[PDB]
Structure 1
Amino acid sequence: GDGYNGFGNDGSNFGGGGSYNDFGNYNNQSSNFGPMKGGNFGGRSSGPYGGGGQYFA
């Protein structure tokens, strides 16, 4: 099958080292190593029901 011979995969210290950073919500922020099946996704929404609006600002 497929293979992977990566040396030095790092992927570390996600936040970057800035202070006062705000991490939003429903994100995918994972670090994944090794064979993966099923793919990688972001957050999912089903929007508000019964006429509720969805607002970003």
Structure 2
Amino acid sequence: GSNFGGGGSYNDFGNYNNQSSNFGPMKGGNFGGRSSGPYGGGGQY
């Protein structure tokens, strides 16, 4: 009889995938991975 997240627990556990593959010349970018707060994620500015 074990509690597993019961109560008001905010239980966020999701798998996330960003995948990209290119044979030719890649000047651009695939910006992946979690981010939070204003302007999260990478790039120019």
TM class by shorter chain equals under 0.3
The normalised TM-score by structure 2 is 0.26
Identity rate, percent: 100
The DSSP-based 3-state class of the residue aligned with 2:15 is coil
Q: Any idea what the Cα deviations from partners look like across 1:12-38, whole Å, max 9, x if unmatched?
A: 999999999999644321222211112
**RMSD of aligned Cα (Å):** 13.0
Count of residues in correspondence between the two structures? 45
Which structure has more strand as a fraction of its residues? 1
- Misfit runs of 4+, over 3 Å: 11-26, 47-55
